[model samples]
Target chain A: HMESADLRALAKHLYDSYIKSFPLTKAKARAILTGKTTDKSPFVIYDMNSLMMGEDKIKHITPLQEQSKEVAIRIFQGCQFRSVEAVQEITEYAKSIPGFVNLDLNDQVTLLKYGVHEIIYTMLASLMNKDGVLISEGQGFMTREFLKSLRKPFGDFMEPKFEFAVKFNALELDDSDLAIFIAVIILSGDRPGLLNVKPIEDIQDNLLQALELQLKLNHPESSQLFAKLLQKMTDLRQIVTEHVQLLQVIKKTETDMSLHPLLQEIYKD
Target chain B: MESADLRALAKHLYDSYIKSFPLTKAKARAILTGKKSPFVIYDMNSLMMGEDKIKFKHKEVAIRIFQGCQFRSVEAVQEITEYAKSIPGFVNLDLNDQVTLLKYGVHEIIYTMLASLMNKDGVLISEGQGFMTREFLKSLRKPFGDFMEPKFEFAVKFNALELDDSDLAIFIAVIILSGDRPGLLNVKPIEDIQDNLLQALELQLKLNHPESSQLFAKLLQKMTDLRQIVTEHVQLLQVIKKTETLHPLLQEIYK
Candidate 1:
């Protein structure tokens, strides 16, 4: 059995050897798509391929798996929610779609956040930007013509009007847009993919970098905000890592399905 | 049936029988005040005793008739009154003082409108916490510190400082402390009340007394900052008239 020292050595080697940092340029992304005699590996495992961060069509209930727990689901339903049940149901199906059965806890959190972000952004895009142009453009960007049409229908009194105007005309798109675009391109229920596995680190690194920029701009308020976001991400990372570690420990002891029904139950649905 | 005859009669009645002109000046208010004996009578009869031409303490007017209305047996009022009996075996102070405040509070329909008007005038006394740490009173000279007392020689009741302790327990004391001169609670029209009132009257006269846009505009312009306060007052009034019991927050004040 691999000890703590062994796992650490293996993890370090895997990280250093497999994970490479490169500016996600158009050429690099295209290379990822075409697999054309590129410097990168052609093997597309879920942990290697970028589809792990793709956009989801269904709504996400919580960033927690607690809602999937019977007790939590009953409590949620008892609270008399209008959308929570539907969202929870959809989430159940969404979690299943990934066949995240093989995914470790760290990857689970990554998938959950990715799925939630994708669904929210797309729906927001559907509501706010009908043409789908503004949503992809950036955080606060939209076409000026669309903004102009918006003012008359909705009361563009003073502050809100000026804000929308600035956001629509100015502001630049960044990695968030790139990540969201790739997510939408990949997991858009409209276009389902035949993929064995997609890597989460590709998406996580982009999101983290964006978050770093956000923290830099946050100034005096950044400490608290950064703490909260980092705590959440840490929690997710812990859950994923722990889950995988437990599974690894389980598999190490068991040679086959003869001793326990855990594997059979895991792959049941 | 005959228009000319009706006009002649009206003229004769106006000249000889009726008071010819309207009540004007401060003394006219005295005329209504001096006739206070009639108040209890009219109030008991479910009739509003007019305070000169415009205002009345609606509770003062309502008490007489309300007493005669078997409200003593009414479920909600009776239940509260029953509880009032066990409230520390009363000091036998003015029975009216203890009991009356509980029952004859001002009609919120009028008071709420008045409060809204004060809010519009930017004169309502309001205070918030974190106010008494330092010489917070000295900080009142700032522009944002319109909350200060003695703005332009007119003393206001509320604390001027942004961070101040002005909970309900301290409200009455603050009012007492700020009471420097006559008209301590100065509710006055900023730009002539008569101007808007006259506009309303004139619009009502025109359209051959038919109510429409001019009437609505006149109603709107009658209060300061029509957009913020007056429209809300109109809605509040409608809701008050519709609902039988006032909200408990308002009810607790009288109690």
Candidate 2:
């Protein structure tokens, strides 16, 4: 049995490492959200500047009439790309945890399959300010208003998440809290089709033990902090399921549009 | 009901349901595949009753086993809802909100408590009756089985958590008092009650169990898993409910 203090120390170390992996500045992030910072390098100002130009590189520009459709697609794609990156970071983090890599490959995939979305949303919730996430690493911020203004199904899928993200941010969890929480989410043993459930569960138990100690030491006066953090996870699951439903609608109706291959696998039943 | 009474009643419902009694995958292999039915009925009294006499009683046994499990299943749900009503403020909500919460939350609560009844081999169906093997449980169908396999799968792993009776009591309380149900009348007040139960649970867990804090964390994580399982359960029920006519009560609660 790990001591509470030792477990907390380890969690703190993890929190530092995970946060360091993504460097975000609040100033640049806010500037991007309000369109105050527009750094157009390769693609300069033009007649269809808003359509043709954004950050770097000459981007694909949908015709003016189809601009909303294009932006909606781009936003969904952005969410997916971010999700893929989140999965990769979690995979690296999982490898760092003792004994996680030694598990069967199939078991590893099973864990990631069930957990990646939850971890993505966890990190997303952490990055989220009241309004939006610092997209493109603080170069851009996709405001909640812009997200809601998109076309029918596109915005529909994300509205619940924005709603959830706002409430989750209200919890005011710090990096140390999020790091241990994400670890717990990734190491879940309750995922279906796990070959060796016991060892994985043992690892989760230790992580959970560590997380409680971390929450107590981190928050001090908040008696219900840990419970409230746990509750956010259920809320996260609900929103993601809504996202899944929207994806299913996309799958059925919008056959012409292509989804990222990795996302297809993630969304697969 | 007061908090203490709710706690005892929740534990009782969980304990009794697990003890009460009685009661999978898709095709697509190949063209010439064998159609083997996975459902196997094991009659415990066959030898005692004898083959000659058993033949005469087989239909009656079949009827009893099927109806007995279904009745027990519905009965278990009824008892929990009864317990929910006894919670002081739960019934004070709008009639429709009460219906919605019970509709959405019961299966989640059922599967959570079902974890208490499971073991390495399988779950206890009717105390001292017999262990229903995992394979047999998977083989059964709707009104009888389709919905169960996921719950069984979850219960087996959840049983590994090794929660005690008191822990189970507070966990059920959290599940019942959930404010997440859509169309709820007063989400904040309901959530306030849930938070109070959560605090009590954390304290109860600390006092009653060894390694209490970690166990408390583990229990909360299990609630997330239970939510996922119940989401899938509701989805499955939606699909199944469309094609097959269900027990009026099952339809009432599940729908």
Candidate 3:
């Protein structure tokens, strides 16, 4: 009865996120024997083709970028910060989804201004383990110690993400989960100056249901995941706010540091 | 209302694994087309008798015949891919994942299927056209001869499970979709499928063989054996790979 109906719905999610995350990890142990645990020492710039995200063993796959390209560099204090130039692509996701664009275009910018950083941090779960966050399309891993090595609030600003990412990655949300999940985040109705939050809230509500159904089928064991995930979102929101406040301290105290235009613009809001 | 549908899917898997294909179509021809069987299985004494004093063929030739049978295996392997496509949630997996599963999984699947063609004596090849005796196999040069015994032994031992075509189908399905293979980008979904399949099989076993307490776990342990068997099997191939030209497809699957 309801069982078969639910199975058909759940089966759809199997293909949805399954293939999108291929070509990352080469270390596999079975579900049980696969269960024995090991943690890897943080290393820089591995084989560009494979990246096993720390003890969780989820492989990080990056398709929007090159294959067999240059290796990644670790994030450090004296490290010359470069514009990753990847955020515009995420914005592409914001612009393309339905009903969101139909919102006041200014609200669209507002949604993204407040939301994109959270989206990036949330998506970072794919590249993070309890030990570190992978960088440069997973070619590099920055250990928790490595971030703390910067010797200032600069390092402190980076620490919360590791905590968030470590916990988030443990949930094992596929790119499919993150995709719609982030979509709902941008369409959030709680923000300032919204003329009508009605339909967008409706859209987010629909995505919430789909994400719930998706988790139900794919992760069957994590019966409480749908609730835990939204709880995770609030944790993410708190962390991002703390990040911006700490960021202000860094900018006022330091000289010769630069922020990408969008991030700079995002901070002003 | 809550869970009956899983059994329905498992039942369909049985039909898909067992009933849809007509084994009669190709295998029947092997009876006539098969080359004369290589040696006497019942009596090793007569195996030497028929040879008229030639105890073994050239090592190169025996290896050659083995690869020829390997060619037969490649076609047998093809159906397995099609069968996976028919499994309830299998086709829904990513394309590369399908490749990953098939690569690490084929030998395990093939070994399980061997029970169909094997007797205490030896395995039938080319669809029963040619039966190679275990006695004759023992006489061949080291690894070439050495390779078949453990697998043959596995087939006979695994055969004791009395899994019908339907059970074998689900069992085969489980082997191919195992999440333990390396190089996967997204494991959660694949792992999810394996967990559900394991559940389905455990339940199926309860219904089908409830009298036995250990059959499911005993069968589950066979995956470990198959893993070792395939590992040894691959190393054996690599040993010959230095000298032999395995088919292009073979190189890809085993690569």
Quote the TM-score that chain A achieves in each candidate.
0.23, 0.82, 0.72
Off by over 4 Å in 2: A23-69, B1-255
lDDT scores in order: 0.27, 0.60, 0.61
Per-residue lDDT of B167-238 in model 1, one digit per residue for the tens?
A: 111111111121122232332221122233233233333423353445434333322232233344446435
In the range A163-229, model 3's lDDT, one tens digit per residue, is 8877887787765566667777888888777757787787676666667777787689997998899
Residue clash pairs of candidate 2: B1-B87, B1-B88, B21-B126, B141-B145
lDDT for position B57 in model 3: 20
DockQ order, best first, reads 2, 3, 1
Assess the local accuracy of residue A51 in candidate 2 as a C-alpha lDDT between 0 and 100. Answer: 27
Report per-candidate DockQ: 0.00, 0.01, 0.01
Output the lDDT of residue A76, model 1: 25
Error of 1 at A70 (Å): 15
Model 1, range A128-164, lDDT digits (tens) per residue? 3222121111211223233333222121211232333
True contacts kept of each: 0.00, 0.00, 0.00
Query: Residue by residue across B1-255, what tens digits does model 2's lDDT show?
Result: 456755564455445434332220011111112333222233344322433332211133333444344444454565565556555566566655666777677777777766665544455443323344555555554444555566667876776765665566567767877888878777876887687677777666776775645878887898888878777766875675466542221222222
